[PDB]
Design a protein around this nucleic acid. Sequence first.
DNA 1: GCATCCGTGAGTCGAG
DNA 2: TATAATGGGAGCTGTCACGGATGC
Lengths: 221, 105, 111, 14, 1112, 170, 104
Amino acid sequence: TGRGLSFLDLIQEGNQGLIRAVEKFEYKRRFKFSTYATWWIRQAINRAIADQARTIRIPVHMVETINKLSRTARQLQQELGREPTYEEIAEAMGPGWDAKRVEETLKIAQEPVSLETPIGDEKDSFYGDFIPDEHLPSPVDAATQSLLSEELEKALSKLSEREAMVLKLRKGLIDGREHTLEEVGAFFGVTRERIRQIENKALRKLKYHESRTRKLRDFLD
Amino acid sequence: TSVYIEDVLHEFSTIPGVKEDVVEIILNLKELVVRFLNPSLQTVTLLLKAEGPKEVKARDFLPVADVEIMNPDLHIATLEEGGRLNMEVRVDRGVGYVPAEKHGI
Amino acid sequence: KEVRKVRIALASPEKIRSWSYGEVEKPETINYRTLKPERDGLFDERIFGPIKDYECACGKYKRQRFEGKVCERCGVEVTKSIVRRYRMGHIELATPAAHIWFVKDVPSKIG
Amino acid sequence: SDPVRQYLHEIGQV
Amino acid sequence: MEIKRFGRIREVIPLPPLTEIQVESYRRALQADVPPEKRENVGIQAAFRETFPIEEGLVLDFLEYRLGEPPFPQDECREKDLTYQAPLYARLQLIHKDTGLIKEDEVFLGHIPLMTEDGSFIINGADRVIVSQIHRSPGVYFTPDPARPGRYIASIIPLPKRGPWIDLEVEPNGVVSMKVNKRKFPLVLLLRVLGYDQETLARELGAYGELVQGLMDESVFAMRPEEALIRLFTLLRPGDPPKRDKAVAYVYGLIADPRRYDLGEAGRYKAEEKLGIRLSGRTLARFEDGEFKDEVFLPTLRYLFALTAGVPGHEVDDIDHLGNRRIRTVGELMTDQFRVGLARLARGVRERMLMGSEDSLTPAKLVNSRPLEAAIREFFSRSQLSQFKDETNPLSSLRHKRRISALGPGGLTRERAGFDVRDVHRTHYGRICPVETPEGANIGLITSLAAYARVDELGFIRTPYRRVVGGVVTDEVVYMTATEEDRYTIAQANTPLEGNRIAAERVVARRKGEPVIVSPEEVEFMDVSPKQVFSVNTNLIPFLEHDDANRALMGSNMQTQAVPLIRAQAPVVMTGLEERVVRDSLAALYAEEDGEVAKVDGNRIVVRYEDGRLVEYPLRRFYRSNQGTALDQRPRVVVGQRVRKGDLLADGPASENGFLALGQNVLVAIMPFDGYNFEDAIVISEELLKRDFYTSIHIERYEIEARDTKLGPERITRDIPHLSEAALRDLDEEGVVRIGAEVKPGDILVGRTSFKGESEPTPEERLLRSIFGEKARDVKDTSLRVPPGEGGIVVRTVRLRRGDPGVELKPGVREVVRVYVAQKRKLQVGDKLANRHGNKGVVAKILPVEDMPHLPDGTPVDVILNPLGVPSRMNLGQILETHLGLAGYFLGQRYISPIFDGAKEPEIKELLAQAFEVYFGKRKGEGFGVDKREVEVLRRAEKLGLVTPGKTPEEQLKELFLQGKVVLYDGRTGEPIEGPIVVGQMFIMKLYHMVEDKMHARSTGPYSLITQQPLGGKAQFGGQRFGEMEVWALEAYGAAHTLQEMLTLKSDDIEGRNAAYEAIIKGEDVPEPSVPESFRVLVKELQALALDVQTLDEKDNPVDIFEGLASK
Amino acid sequence: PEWMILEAVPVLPPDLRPMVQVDGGRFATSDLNDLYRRLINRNNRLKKLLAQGAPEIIIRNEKRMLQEAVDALLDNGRRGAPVTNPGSDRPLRSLTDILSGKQGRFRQNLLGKRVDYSGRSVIVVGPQLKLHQCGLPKRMALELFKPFLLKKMEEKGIAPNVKAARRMLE
Amino acid sequence: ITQGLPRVIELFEARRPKAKAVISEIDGVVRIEETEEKLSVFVESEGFSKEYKLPKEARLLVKDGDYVEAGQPLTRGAIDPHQLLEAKGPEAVERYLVEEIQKV
DNA sequence: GCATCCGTGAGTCGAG
DNA sequence: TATAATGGGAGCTGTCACGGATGC
Ligand SMILES: [Mg+2]
Ligand SMILES: [Zn+2]
């Protein structure tokens, strides 16, 4: 108990181990059943503790390495009268273990914490109430994106519709993907050198318009 | 209107061998009374340099032409054996009460 | 059309399965190394949706040109990632289980 | 009332 | 100046050490200085002795323990975010019963936090205070049954979490029932298990009329103790097999196991005194020679029946008596959590004893210290009673250490406390302050230790009195509990005395708290001082007897909130306690022995003592407190000075020459001023800012971490993309701002770059990139800038790095950078001021000096207080303080006015006459007569009956001055105030609630994860909560569109808020909102409950608010 | 009526029970994940113990534990002991606890919300104001009206566009 | 010496008071029967009779031989609003609740 | 008709 | 994969006042 699984969960996993022991027992060896059953029972209990206790599941060999690191640090602190540094632990772990490896193994073993962890004496606050949402764009971001699209269309209208269309096809404004020169040339019916040339001249006219009006500079961050 | 002290980066510091902190030194310098004899004079930078055991007063300022310190007994600092003080205080003409946060001189 | 009423009623197991975009088979959240959602787990993009907008898990289709297209390699639909707030999953139970609301709210409705 | 007590009783029958 | 003091009471004893409740308790708990063989069975020694030995075979026993030295000093712990603690070792020995082999070793158990000299702790680099708890003392109580008027409930109560509450009741059917773990059963059964027989019960309880007959059950005596024991075990454990040894084990653990059941030593003593018996141990029964033997049950049943019958000498108990309520101090709480951690360690020990190689097991292999470490760390970090230290000023820390809470683990729950727990009991006299307590919900639950009060070894609060023999007051003083106090007739400390003899024929005294007029022959004890009735904060309020208690409460609590001013002054009217507060708080520095001062610096003071030794005292200079208020010591001696033992060497924060200096002494006029002091607002003179009165230094800490990522390392650097030299001006080579720089909102404190997320550039990004021909950089600006509305002068930078000596950070981070920024705050419109009498207000107007009301000699007042705040609040002490402050303003002196030994009105009048001499004879000598405006004001005052008619102008001005009133001229007009105004010197503090910290505003910002609603709090740049009641306001106004706009466009309508922001920046009206996201969350969370929620139109046909994104 | 008995337990969309990386690079997550994990572990173990033909006592215990798992998921602490994470007395937050109470969904996020374009500060008497007036600090009003201010700055010459004005106000 | 907000809540919740007044279920005339030990009050109609037994120390709002309305208080105390509703009807309860809250 | 046990509630905003 | 090992361990606490379903 107290290793991350309920009493009943441990009991059911030991029941699975007991079923295995039953199906693998050989009475001919004159051994009592308990001696063979205890092996599989401990085996199943430990497999369950290793496989289910963590909210972020860790492979069983990695959990064994983590527990070895735990025991090692605990013996080192029981002999040192203080918590050991990464370097002392890497020493005691043997070869192939440098301090950076101990640090990475500890970072990989960090368990998550509850978003419902309380803050304060009277339960008026949660821990999740301080986590900003980074994924969904802010109104400022969406507004800047819309103004960018509108300014790019404002600048793309100063081109002819063909050079504007070539730029839009080549950069992905139209269908979401960027086409090769051969595809834009097969669409407009022109050589890849010609389509790349009108792309260059459209970019050049846009560069001139931008040096003149400076309307798109502020969007470059 | 302004103070510079050598080996002092800001107002919340202390100078070794000196009893008062810089906050108290500026509080004392606020009470300095400087008279301008030339009417065309706008700003002056008084210079002070003292050391060893002493009690630096407003007299210790190096005299300037057309500038008279009206309270030479005003205490400024209590310097100890090895204590050293080296100040440049800027004094201006003005009207009323202008806090430091407004003129930033 | 405009909303005028709000109905609330019991959900049949068939209704629950009609909601679900996939059964959650494993009690696993995200890989301890890649920090990406595990397969058949509680955060599987194959069920609930892409984590990034219009990009599947492996990255074969990353643009808006594919909308509704289900990938062959990773099996993740390419749509807006906002759907990860809206797509139910389900758990198919071995034995039926009683909804405690209809058991312990006295007087018991089942009782 | 206590599921582990219930199970320990069920175990005590065999 | 001269300090004239009043009062005739000579205090026989000084105030005890004000932090002794903390320091002595923890000292008693640890016994670190006691050699182990000399340690007592209390403290953590008791925890060890209770947990050990550990059996089953194998046996692990306890020998002793020892505490090492702290690996780091207190200051280094404060800086490195460490804990000031000592290593805990325990000598253990494993013994195999059969083998006899004994392996002994000293195992390491972790660390125990040490208490600092002033009584606080340093946990993870922050000072913390363990607040004492108040609770019901263990023992046996008899309370009236509320249902049955003639019957009584007996209650046996052990220490918290040390056993079950046991109730004995006389049932309506006659049989006496016992309730334990919420199980009622006839007590006769347990009496049988104890070995009692009907003969003994009949001869003991037969004297009570037919009450013993409810105890007579034949089916119980028809069975031996074993059969009754198994009967009880079956009655207590349904379904559990009624084994014999299991029944003995459970019953022993329930009643007789000292390692499971434990009354207090207090509970032991109280049960002994109440029932009139003696106890061998702290349990209800014992296991002796294979059977059970009773200790408590029969005496309790006897007392219960005697009380029910009505025999004399038996009385119900008052559970709010301070003889039945006790205090759990730091030692007891820490020892409890230590005992819990030790029990967990012992469970682990037995677990390992079952497994493993039975032959080779050292103690080190058996003891996993981690549960004990975890229990201790959890107690000191996340206990309801382990509070962030309040070090706003020295008095804050002191009062905090003297708090008493009824809340917390083992205490009372919120809303579970009625009027009784919150009332001030008659026994609080001299023990718990009757005035210092919070307003609001916690009133009467958080209280404060009285000044002369002490907590004894059993945990009851004791107060001192003086012996009175034959009307003679001895100097012998006796500390009593309330139980002892109720035995005597105790006179008031103000009874007249000629020498040591009671001078009056009639004496005012208390008998069991009741007031009575009594003869000097009848007086047994006498109060030590009025000071002993109140807390330390309350004892700092002069003229307390003239203040209503509800406002004295505020005046007391608000001194805790006084900000240390750069020019702090002790009040001109003190109570005689302002020096001990500075001393016991350890803020100021004193002289350890008589000596001569060798060196004096802004940073150090070196003293040569009589021993010839040279002791150097470093001065804490500009240190940031828990609340950010600057704690700096300043030297008050000079080189070559002679100093005796206890002389002042340095002034602590909020200290003036060793006197508690929480504010300024300002010149106050009491009059309305054009509505700028309306409803407790305050008008102040700009002069106060000119001389830097009410100016305070505040330091803020900023922190940043550069860590390792799966996308590359974050790194602190001056190379931040897309920023000019204008942005990087004050940044050093490494990317940290320079010491001494001025930082405003938006300025970079520490530069930092972070590798971008896996970037799929939108087509607009690719096209703009091609237009401007610049590769999108690999990193992004994540620099720590200055929050909105903050800033100052950079005074410190700390940089810790991985791979550097003495440094090891949490796994993953490369480096940590801290920037300490200080700011000097003048008083501004919106800051909060208060006096010690509960007059609190906000500065609403700062007039230029020429607009200020002024005296005839051209002296302008400092602050204008509105008189309308006086009458309803009934706090007149501020008036008398203003009067005596006027007197001491013109005489140039201060005063000591003990609280109820105050300066009376006639003496204040004498001093005011002398002050008027100084104020007016000066004028008459300088060659000036009485002013015409003074004549007009004198006519007005003559109509008011303030001056007698026909006296001279000077005589009438003196008549007014003795009333504390003066002529005052309006600064804007020159005309006088039509009446004479009360002007004088008053002590006013600047409180911590400064508008600079509180102003906040947000257009848009961060939103919460699930709800997509704005975060809360100023620190998160959050939005204001528009709660249910604000919604009711908008509904009652019928402002439908404003309300809908709150519920959608400004909170969690994602599309709505985005479109609204775009419309406003474009110049268009905001669009009609759509469905808020939190309702979608509601719908989905109801779906997760297997409830189909359907939005329908008027045709009852479904409507999809998820716009298809949820339907397959 | 039989719909009051569950065959297929629904699973909440993962964003409403997040698994998010906080500032320091560590992870914070909702209790619903641990409740669902309990449920799925017990249900999978039941499916296996059925596939392997286990005795009656064992399958009975497994089914009892499965019911109590579902109960903790839907309304924890309602029946029996509340399900707590290891090393903590704190009950886990089920769906019932998310809906009902002071802090529940209805009262906390639906009948009242935190809101944009809002501020607060200390009040002050200001007797010069007419009845229909109040004194609003300049910085408060700048932030509260920020988009209007960007628009009006673009209308004048104070900034080339909205984004430049915002960077200038930063 | 008033009941206050607790009384207001007791009213808005239509709760049956602790120290309640006994009211008559019908019309009739009052015949008091007071033994030195026990006390009762009879309300007698022209063909009916009702009996209300009450504690000895209860104060009477009625003089012997008086004609009382259905739902009229006989004892001093707060009326149970539900008893008043059954005896006298809805308008009576509305009047009673409004006046009782307004008293506070 | 009447005690008794169990579930449900017990103010707002603000900083933590 | 084999000596034999065969039923647990913590509650835990000074509250009203309703509604309001189960036992005499
Ligand atoms: Mg190594
Ligand atoms: Zn894919």
